[PDB]
């Protein structure tokens, strides 16, 4: 029907072109009979007829005419939907400033005239004057006056002088301005003169000007001359039942505007004095500005009510505007809603659905089939037949259901498994039966939550809901490859009871010919469910190429494992059922069955697991009781010991021996020690308490306690809650966040008295309040993440680039937190990776890595893999499928088309509810030190002069088991490459003492060290070695204030000791508190100290927003020799000396704060100059795009893996891509852009590849990271920038620019109601894009 949406300003000729009438009178409807009043706000000749094809008088009532207008009273006899469509206008007598171009924060009349906003409001409220091109006599153009100054200027200059006041003055200012003359002027001011922040504002203003002239706008259209009015059926005045009406408040607003306009015309007829008409023009300004956007004035309230009324921008902007209440989400027919329930007799491609809901939803289908089958002659008979519910319609309804999927939906639809299709089975009842294994996908418990069904009407939607959204398709999460149809609670208890073994049972150690007589023995009662038994089983395997090689053997197993073995499909080995089968084990079982046998055996296998789990859980009789929580006999003894120990610390505090804080810390440590002893008592009193006998004395085993099975199976709860039921419960925290010294020494099996329970109540209520508030903030985080990233669609099959990031394991300080295998599994390689024997190609350059390839990775010794990442792709306006990866509900590579920005942002924001010395080496291997520069001291050790040293514990297989960020100046015992043992502290630094260690060996001296000024004479009481030690800034005198104390070295001859290898001596400058221990002329060795210097979810919403950290890590711009400049300004000049390039960079550092580097050293670009958090801007601007995306993914994966929630890294990487789309160009060159202009990276990239393919020079850019609430509004498509965030600024910024929106990316297409260019509609948009302009 149409293409791209265009937006611009409205000329008064354009507004008279729209309108079909002038609304001259403030009436709405006649009061006695409710015909509309001519010609009021509700008119006939202006807008349309009231009834379908009927004049208002009655001369034309039927379809005899449609073109005529009645000459008694004007009515264009048409449909009344036309009254929903035609618009009106108001001829405003005096002109009026448009509030959107006056009061939004980047004010357009404000910085279009280059005039401050308070002076503009001073002109518009008739408080002052302004000259309007008044020649050149004495007064400038923008020079305002007052009334007395106006009398001054008029008596001093009677003529050739022009200065009005009010809206006429601003309109004359905007009309008088010649734009391109000032364009030349500002280009000259940006060529010669340089006033940095002011010229940045100036180049912003010239950007606005040459964007304005490039549009088709005129400036004086920012002042309203003729104001359009909205159609009547958008501001309706309709009868309620009872003779009383509902008006919209826009009727009040247009009534006030029309009223004051008629008053101002009536006053200018009667030639009113100036005070009265200036009052009336201010009032008309207020009326119009209250109509366009009420709330940017004194909030003009309505009549007979204190509540503020609702204007137009109130109806566009906000939670209740059209963008978010009636366009992005609509209330939908063919839907239903009821309470959900279990019904375990279902296969998971089907759900229950009530007969009454199925009759109410599918009414037109039933109507169609009944008039086809001739049981109803007409359709009214079909209505009465389904109304009376005769017995013939239920067979008809069973025909129309049979293969027609419905959509089930739970209301917090966070991730994309919230809407799934099913096939209905009709239910005698009124509750939707919902399959149990599906419910963990919904986060739906059955405690009264109610779900909604929708019906795909058309045929394509039926095929979509079957092919894409049927429940058997979604058995893998989009967040990771883990199964989401994991068996949840009863079924895992039935399994964990079924596959276990007690040492004596019926049929102990007998022999069985197969699983079938295992079932015949259990169900006859001769042999027990669990007894260790040799059976004969036949397992199949995929040894040959997709071939089922059979091997049979006598496995030593139990009875119940053999009974479960009938349910395992052919492909799996027997070792998947030979263990105890908790929840983790059954998730691994379903994962291996899917990764081997495909989809169909996994679906039917999940159904059979659920059936057998519920059945043998029923046969289990696993029942909780009061004897099932064994209290330790060692409980009250440990509590009495702790009660004596707190009395010991109480006597030690009443003796004045300790202070309060160390008392507090000792008491909390001994109560935590008592709690840990109680936990290790109760666990050993539960889990091994069952001790029974077979052919001998005794033997212990794991317990058949009910609560131990319910905690060990992973069904519900873990040992924290079992601890709070049996042992003492924890140490509660008061509302301070402080934690009470008297813990709750009673569990729930014992009673709690009043004070303990009253203390526990605070933790409970804080928990509930935090769950509510974190729910709200997680919703907001999901919304920002999807609205920054709906534009991204997999569009090309392959780009073919060599880019990529470097996947390494994420080990840090302790053991492995996420290995190499489950990071790289699913991605694709950029270049080929090689064996530790080099030139051995183990994978080629770009193959999709699946599980056998990661097996090939682990059988070799690979540690680091280069991987194609979506943040470094080459594709225009999307991500090519061969670069993205594979992870989806399927296991193959991502298809061409499917939206991954939306699934990525949902898979990030969906777990938002769930969110909150020396080297002690653990493991053994060989030692490696990266970026190390050290020197052997006299004591046989090794002192380190480079602080980029990374310690790696490399075993015999090349991989890294431990890493340690080596501090500067540590004391290594072993060297590098020597085989180290466990526990061996190699480097032992002093963490309280910053080292001033050297590379030299000679006589330490004083240089520029004046006694009493830079250094004081201290005489020690403990050690006794008196010295001259550097003091602070307050006490150092005005001579030695800027003069700094320095240390330097000579040998025995008196000549200056040079560093062995270079020519610079070690002259080092000490800060305050840097203790000079060794004095003038005292020998040291290599690296001795010349002195000593003693002493949750909003994290994620800070990372993706990329807010500036509070104390930033400072980083060197370019690599070079670091040096100091001037002293004592509060800052210091950090000067860099590159060897090859031009040096003269210096940066202000607040010199109170502890630095890291010494002046004698040299830093690399992007190396740290101090510590603390760092901004993402610095990491992107110095190191590289790969480094900043690694920084974001490692930080936010630390935040998620702290809670223990897996999210695949593709999603975070593609949000990082959607962050940094904008990039400011540095060198313009042959391009059209500017030296400070901000344009998106894809637009400058297609410009350069047209120019760089030619012989011309391109345009060099500066990549610029933006936050998610700012990279989503800085968009070349304004409806996606106007649908969620600040609306008024976006519509005015895109209305002054004449910006054109090409619908580009799923937000606009949901808005405008056509197909989506991601999913099934991608083929349609591809056909149209091939058709469009070709």
Partner 1 sequence: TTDPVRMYMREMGTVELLTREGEIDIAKRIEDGINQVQCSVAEYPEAITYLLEQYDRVEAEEARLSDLITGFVDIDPELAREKFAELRAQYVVTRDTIKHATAQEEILKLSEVFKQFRLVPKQFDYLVNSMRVMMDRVRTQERLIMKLCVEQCKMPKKNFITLFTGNETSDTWFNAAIAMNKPWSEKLHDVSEEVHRALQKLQQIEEETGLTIEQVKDINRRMSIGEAKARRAKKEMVEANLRLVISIAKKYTNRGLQFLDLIQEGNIGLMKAVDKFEYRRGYKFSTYATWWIRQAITRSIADQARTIRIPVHMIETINKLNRISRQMLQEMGREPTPEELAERMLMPEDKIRKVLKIAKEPISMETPIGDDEDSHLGDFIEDTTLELPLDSATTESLRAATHDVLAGLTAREAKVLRMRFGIDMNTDYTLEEVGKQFDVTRERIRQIEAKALRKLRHPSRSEVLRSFLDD
Binding region for partner 1 (CB under 8 A): 26-31, 37, 62-65, 80, 121, 125-127, 236-238, 240, 243-249, 251-252, 255-256, 259-260, 263, 266-267, 270-276, 278-280, 282-283, 286, 297-298, 300, 302-305, 307, 309-310, 319-320, 325, 367, 377-381, 383-384
Q: Name the one range near RNA by CB under 7 A: 54-62, 698-706, 711-719, 980-988.
A: 54-62
Instruction: Give how many residues touch RNA by CB under 7 A.
Output: 39
The item of Mg ion, Zn ion, partner 1, none sharing an interface with residue 1016, based on CB under 5 to 8 Å by kind, is none
Q: CB-wise, 249 or 1213, nearer to partner 1? A: 249
In the complex, the smallest distance separating the C-beta of residue 402 from partner 1, rounded to whole angstroms, is 24
What do you get for the CA distance between the two ends of the chain, in Å? Answer: 18
Q: Is 799 annotated as a binding residue?
A: yes
Question: What is the CB neighbour count within 10 angstroms for residue 1015?
Answer: 20
**Which residue in 146, 579, 761, 775 binds RNA (CB under 7 A)?**
775
Can you tell me the distance from the alpha carbon of 1029 to that of 1073, in angstroms, rounded to the nearest whole number?
8
**Which residue in 319, 380, 388, 1330 binds RNA (CB under 7 A)?**
319
Q: Are 1000 and 963 in contact (CB under 8 A)?
A: no
Can you tell me the distance from the alpha carbon of 876 to that of 338, in angstroms, rounded to the nearest whole number?
46
DSSP notation for 1228-1267: -TTSS--TT-EEEHHHHHHHHHHHTTTTS----EEE----
Q: CB-wise, 9 or 309, nearer to partner 1? A: 309
Q: Are 287 and 263 in contact (CB under 8 A)?
A: no
Q: Is 873 annotated as a binding residue?
A: yes
Q: Which phi and psi angles does 111 have, rounded to 5°?
A: -100, 15
Q: Is 883 annotated as a binding residue?
A: yes
In the complex, the smallest distance separating the C-beta of residue 1215 from Zn ion, rounded to whole angstroms, is 16
Of 864-893, binders to Zn ion (CB under 5 A) are: 873, 880, 883
Q: CB-wise, 262 or 777, nearer to RNA? A: 777
Q: Name the one range near RNA by CB under 7 A: 314-322, 625-633, 683-691, 1007-1015.
A: 314-322
Can you tell me the distance from the alpha carbon of 559 to that of 500, in angstroms, rounded to the nearest whole number?
9
In the complex, the smallest distance separating the C-beta of residue 580 from Zn ion, rounded to whole angstroms, is 45
- What are the structure tokens assigned to 548, written together? 């089922």
Per DSSP, the three-state class of 1209 is helix
Instruction: Return the half-sphere exposure (C-beta side, CA atoms, 13 A cut-off) of residue 475.
Output: 26
Can you tell me the distance from the alpha carbon of 291 to that of 257, in angstroms, rounded to the nearest whole number?
8
Secondary structure element (H or E) that encloses residue 699, with its range:
strand 699-700
Q: CB-wise, 716 or 817, nearer to Mg ion? A: 716
- What are the structure tokens assigned to 161, written together? 């002088």
Provide the pairing of β-strand 350-354 with 335-341: unpaired
Can you tell me the distance from the alpha carbon of 1103 to that of 1175, in angstroms, rounded to the nearest whole number?
10
21: left (phi over 0), alpha (psi -120 to 50) or beta: left
Q: Is 43 annotated as a binding residue?
A: no
Q: CB-wise, 319 or 380, nearer to RNA? A: 319
In the complex, the smallest distance separating the C-beta of residue 60 from partner 1, rounded to whole angstroms, is 11
The item of Zn ion, Mg ion, RNA, none sharing an interface with residue 883, based on CB under 5 to 8 Å by kind, is Zn ion
Q: CB-wise, 529 or 1282, nearer to RNA? A: 1282
Q: CB-wise, 218 or 266, nearer to partner 1? A: 266
**776 counts as binding RNA under rule CB under 7 A:** yes
Q: CB-wise, 270 or 544, nearer to partner 1? A: 270
In the complex, the smallest distance separating the C-beta of residue 807 from partner 1, rounded to whole angstroms, is 47
Q: Are 794 and 879 in contact (CB under 8 A)?
A: yes
Q: CB-wise, 175 or 278, nearer to partner 1? A: 278
Q: Which residues face 1313 on adjacent strands?
A: none
- What are the structure tokens assigned to 980, written together? 């180290």
**37 counts as binding RNA under rule CB under 7 A:** yes
Q: Please, is 943 exposed, middle or buried when counting C-beta atoms within 10 Å of its C-beta (0-12, 13-18, 19+)?
A: buried
Place of tokens 């939906």: 409
Q: Are 971 and 1122 in contact (CB under 8 A)?
A: no
Q: Please, is 62 exposed, middle or buried when counting C-beta atoms within 10 Å of its C-beta (0-12, 13-18, 19+)?
A: exposed
Per DSSP, the three-state class of 1292 is helix
In the complex, the smallest distance separating the C-beta of residue 44 from partner 1, rounded to whole angstroms, is 16
Q: CB-wise, 65 or 164, nearer to partner 1? A: 65
The item of RNA, partner 1, Mg ion, none sharing an interface with residue 367, based on CB under 5 to 8 Å by kind, is partner 1
**Which residue in 420, 1288, 1292, 1309 binds RNA (CB under 7 A)?**
1288
Q: CB-wise, 588 or 1177, nearer to RNA? A: 1177
In the complex, the smallest distance separating the C-beta of residue 832 from Zn ion, rounded to whole angstroms, is 17
**337 counts as binding RNA under rule CB under 7 A:** yes
Of 791-850, binders to Zn ion (CB under 5 A) are: 799
The item of Zn ion, Mg ion, RNA, none sharing an interface with residue 1107, based on CB under 5 to 8 Å by kind, is RNA
Is omega for the bond preceding 458 within 30 degrees of 0, making it cis? no
The item of Mg ion, partner 1, RNA, none sharing an interface with residue 447, based on CB under 5 to 8 Å by kind, is Mg ion
For residue 1186, CA distances in Å to 222, 604, 846, 1179 come to: 46, 44, 19, 10
Q: Name the one range near Zn ion by CB under 5 A: 47-55, 136-144, 340-348, 552-560.
A: 47-55
Secondary structure element (H or E) that encloses residue 259, with its range:
helix 249-269
In the complex, the smallest distance separating the C-beta of residue 851 from Zn ion, rounded to whole angstroms, is 23
Interaction pattern, residues 411-450, with Mg ion; x per rule: CB under 5 A: ------------------------------------x-x-
Q: CB-wise, 1109 or 1184, nearer to Zn ion? A: 1184
Per-residue burial over 857-873, b = 16 or more CB atoms within 10 Å of its CB, e = otherwise: beebebbebbbbbbbbb
**Which residue in 17, 69, 114, 116 binds RNA (CB under 7 A)?**
116
In the complex, the smallest distance separating the C-beta of residue 915 from Mg ion, rounded to whole angstroms, is 20
**38 counts as binding RNA under rule CB under 7 A:** yes
Q: Of 318, 528, 348, 367, nearest to 425 (Cα)?
A: 348
List all residues 6 or more positions away from 788 whose beta carbon is below 8 Å from its beta carbon: 905, 1215, 1218, 1219, 1268, 1271, 1272
Q: CB-wise, 447 or 1140, nearer to Mg ion? A: 447
The item of Zn ion, RNA, partner 1, none sharing an interface with residue 272, based on CB under 5 to 8 Å by kind, is partner 1
Q: Is 70 annotated as a binding residue?
A: yes
Q: Quick one: three-class SS letters along 730-764?
A: CCCECCCCCECCCCECCCCCCCCCHHHHHHHHHHH
Instruction: Give how many residues touch Zn ion by CB under 5 A.
Output: 9
Of 1129-1148, binders to RNA (CB under 7 A) are: none
For residue 490, CA distances in Å to 53, 497, 719, 800 come to: 66, 11, 19, 50
**Which residue in 18, 345, 758, 780 binds RNA (CB under 7 A)?**
780
Counts of helices then strands in the chain (DSSP H, E): 39, 45
Q: CB-wise, 227 or 871, nearer to Zn ion? A: 871
- What are the structure tokens assigned to 1098, written together? 């909003």
| Length of the chain, in residues | 1334
Provide the pairing of β-strand 432-433 with 335-341: parallel
Q: What is the DSSP letter of 1184?
A: -
Q: Which phi and psi angles does 1132 have, rounded to 5°?
A: -140, 155
Q: Which residues are annotated as a binding site for Mg(2+)?
A: 445, 447, 449
Q: Which residues bind Mg ion (CB under 5 A)?
A: 447, 449
Q: Which residues are annotated as a binding site?
A: 55, 57, 70, 73, 445, 447, 449, 799, 873, 880, 883
Q: Which residues are annotated as a binding site for Zn(2+)?
A: 55, 57, 70, 73, 799, 873, 880, 883
Q: Which residues bind Zn ion (CB under 5 A)?
A: 55, 57, 70, 72-73, 799, 873, 880, 883
Q: Which residues bind RNA (CB under 7 A)?
A: 32-33, 35, 37-38, 56-59, 72-73, 103-105, 116, 201, 296, 317-319, 329, 331, 337, 411-413, 452, 772, 775-777, 779-780, 1107-1108, 1285-1288
């Amino acid at each position: 029907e149409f293409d791209a949406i265009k937006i611009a300003l409205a000329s008064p000729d354009m507004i008279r072109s729209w309108s079909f009438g002038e609304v001259k009178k403030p009436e709405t409807i006649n009061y006695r009979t409710f015909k509309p009043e001519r010609d009021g706000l509700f008119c006939a000749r202006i807008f349309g007829p009231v009834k379908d094809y009927e004049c208002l008088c009655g001369k034309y009532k039927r379809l005899k005419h449609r073109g005529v207008i009645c000459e008694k009273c004007g009515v264009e006899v048409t449909q009344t939907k036309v009254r929903r469509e035609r618009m009106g206008h108001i001829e405003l007598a005096s002109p009026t400033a448009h509030i959107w171009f006056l009061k939004s924060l980047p004010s357009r009349i404000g910085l279009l005239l280059d005039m401050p906003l308070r002076d503009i409001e001073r002109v518009l409220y008739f408080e002052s004057y302004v000259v309007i091109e008044g020649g050149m006599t004495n007064l400038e153009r923008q020079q305002i006056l007052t009334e007395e100054q106006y009398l001054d200027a008029l008596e001093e200059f009677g003529d050739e002088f022009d200065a009005k006041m009010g809206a006429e003055a601003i309109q004359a200012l905007l009309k008088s301005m010649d734009l391109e003359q000032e364009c030349e002027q500002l280009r000259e001011e940006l060529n010669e003169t340089n006033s940095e922040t002011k010229r940045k504002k100036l180049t912003k203003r010239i950007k606005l000007l040459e964007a304005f002239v490039q549009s088709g706008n005129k400036p004086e259209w920012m002042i309203l001359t003729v104001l359009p009015v909205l159609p009547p059926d958008l501001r309706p005045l309709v009868p309620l039942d009872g003779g009383r009406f509902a008006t919209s408040d826009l009727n009040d607003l247009y009534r006030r505007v029309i009223n004051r306009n008629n008053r101002l015309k009536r006053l200018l007829d009667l030639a009113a004095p100036d005070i009265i008409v200036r009052n009336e023009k201010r009032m008309l300004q207020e009326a119009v500005d209250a109509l366009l956007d009420n709330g940017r004035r004194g909030r003009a309230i309505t009549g007979s009510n204190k509540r503020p009324l609702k204007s137009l921008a109130d109806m566009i902007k906000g939670k209740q505007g059209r963008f978010r209440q009636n366009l992005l989400g609509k209330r939908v027919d063919y839907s239903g809603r009821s309470v959900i329930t279990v019904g375990p007799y279902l296969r998971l491609h089907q759900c229950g659905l009530p007969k009454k809901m199925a009759l109410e939803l599918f009414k037109p289908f039933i109507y169609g089939k009944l008039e086809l089958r001739g049981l109803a002659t007409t359709i009214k008979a079909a209505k009465k037949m389904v109304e009376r519910e005769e017995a013939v319609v239920w067979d008809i309804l069973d025909e129309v259901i049979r293969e027609h999927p419905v959509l089930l939906n739970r209301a917090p639809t966070l991730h994309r498994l919230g809407i799934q299709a099913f096939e209905p089975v009709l239910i005698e009842g009124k509750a939707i039966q919902l399959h149990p294994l599906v419910c963990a996908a919904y986060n739906a418990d059955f405690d009264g939550d109610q779900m909604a069904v929708h019906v795909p009407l058309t045929l394509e939607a039926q095929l979509e809901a079957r092919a894409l959204m049927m429940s058997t398709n979604n058995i893998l999460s989009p967040a990771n490859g883990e199964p989401i149809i994991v068996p949840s609670q009863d079924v895992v208890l039935g399994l964990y009871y079924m596959t276990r073994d007690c040492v004596n049972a019926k049929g102990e150690g007998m022999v069985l010919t197969g699983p079938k007589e295992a079932e015949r023995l259990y169900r006859s009662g001769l042999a027990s469910l669990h007894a260790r038994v040799k059976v004969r089983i036949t397992e199949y395997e995929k040894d040959a190429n997709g071939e089922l090689v059979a091997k049979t053997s006598l496995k030593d197993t139990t009875v119940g494992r053999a009974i479960l073995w009938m349910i395992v499909p052919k492909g799996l080995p027997y070792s998947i059922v030979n263990q105890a089968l908790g929840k983790k084990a059954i998730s691994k079982m379903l994962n291996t069955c899917y990764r081997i046998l495909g989809l169909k055996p996994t679906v039917i296998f999940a159904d059979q697991i659920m059936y057998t789990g519920f059945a043998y859980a029923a046969r289990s009789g696993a029942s909780v009781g009061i004897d099932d929580m064994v209290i330790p006999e060692k409980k009250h003894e440990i509590i009495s010991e702790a009660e004596a120990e707190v009395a010991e610390i109480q006597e030690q505090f009443q003796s004045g021996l300790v202070t309060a804080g160390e008392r507090y810390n000792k008491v909390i440590d001994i109560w935590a020690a008592a709690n840990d002893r109680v936990s290790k008592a109760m666990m050993d009193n539960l889990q091994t308490e069952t001790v029974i006998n077979r052919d001998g004395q005794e033997e212990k085993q794991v317990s058949f306690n009910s609560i131990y099975m319910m905690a060990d199976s992973g069904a519900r709860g873990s040992a924290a809650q079992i601890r709070q039921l049996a042992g003492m419960r924890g140490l509660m925290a008061k509302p301070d966040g402080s934690i009470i010294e008297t813990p709750i020494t009673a569990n729930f099996r014992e009673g709690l008295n009043v004070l303990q329970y009253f203390i526990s109540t605070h933790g409970a209520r804080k928990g509930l309040a935090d769950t509510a508030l974190k729910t709200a903030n997680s919703g907001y985080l999901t919304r920002r993440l999807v609205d920054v990233a709906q534009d991204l669609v997999v569009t090309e099959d392959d780009c073919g680039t060599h880019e990529g990031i470097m996947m390494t394991p994420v080990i840090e300080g302790g053991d492995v937190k996420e290995p190499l295998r489950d990071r790289v599994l699913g991605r694709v390689t950029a270049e080929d990776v090689l064996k530790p024997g080099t030139a051995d190609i183990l994978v080629p350059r770009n193959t999709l890595l699946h599980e056998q390839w990661c097996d090939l990775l682990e059988e070799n010794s690979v540690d680091a893999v280069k991987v194609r990442s979506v943040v470094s792709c080459d594709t225009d306006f999307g991500v090519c499928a061969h670069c993205y990866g594979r992870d989806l509900a399927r296991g193959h590579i991502i298809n061409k088309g499917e939206a991954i920005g939306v699934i990525a942002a949902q898979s990030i924001g969906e777990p938002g509810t769930q969110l909150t010395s020396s080297i002690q080496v653990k493991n053994k291997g060989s030692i490696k030190l990266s970026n190390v520069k050290s020197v052997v001291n006299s004591s046989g050790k090794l002192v380190i002069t480079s602080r980029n040293t990374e310690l790696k514990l490399i075993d015999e297989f090349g991989r890294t088991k431990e890493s340690y960020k080596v501090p500067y100046g540590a004391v290594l015992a072993k060297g590098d490459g020597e085989q180290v043992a466990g526990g061996e502290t190699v480097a032992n630094w002093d963490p309280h003492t910053m080292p001033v260690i050297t590379e030299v060996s000679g006589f330490v001296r004083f240089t520029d060290m004046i006694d009493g000024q830079t250094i004081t004479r201290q005489t020690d009481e403990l050690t006794g070695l008196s010295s001259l030690v550097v003091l602070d800034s307050a006490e150092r005198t005005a001579g030695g204030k800027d003069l700094r104390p320095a240390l330097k070295i000579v040998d025995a001859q008196g000549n200056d000791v040079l560093i062995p290898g270079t020519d610079m001596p070690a002259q080092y400058f000490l800060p305050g508190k840097a203790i000079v221990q060794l004095e003038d002329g005292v020998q040291i060795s290599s690296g001795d100290t010349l002195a000593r210097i003693p002493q949750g979810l909003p994290r994620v919403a800070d990372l993706f927003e990329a807010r500036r950290p509070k104390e930033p890590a400072i980083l060197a711009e370019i690599s070079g020799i670091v040096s100091f400049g001037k002293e004592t300004k509060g800052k210091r000049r950090l000067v860099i000396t590159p060897v090859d390039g031009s040096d003269p960079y210096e940066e202000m550092i607040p010199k109170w704060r502890q630095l890291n580097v010494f002046e004698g050293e040299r830093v690399e670009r992007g190396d740290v100059i101090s510590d603390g958090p760092e901004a993402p801007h610095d990491i992107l601007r110095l190191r590289g795009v790969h480094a900043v995306t690694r920084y974001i993914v490692n930080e936010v994966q630390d935040v998620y893996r702290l809670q223990g929630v897996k999210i695949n890294d593709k999603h975070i990487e593609v949000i990082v891509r959607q962050m940094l789309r904008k990039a400011t160009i540095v060198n313009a060159g042959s391009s059209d852009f500017l030296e400070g202009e901000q344009v998106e990276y894809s637009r400058v990239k297609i410009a350069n590849r047209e120019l760089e393919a030619n012989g011309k020079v391109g345009a060099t850019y500066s990549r610029d990271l933006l936050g998610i609430t700012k990279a989503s509004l800085a968009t070349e498509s304004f409806i996606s920038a106007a649908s969620f965030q600040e609306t008024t600024r976006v519509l005015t910024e895109a209305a002054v620019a004449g910006k054109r929106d090409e619908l580009r990316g799923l937000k606009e297409n949901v808005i405008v109601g056509r197909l989506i260019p991601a999913g099934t509609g991608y083929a349609y948009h591809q056909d149209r894009m091939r058709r469009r302009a070709a």
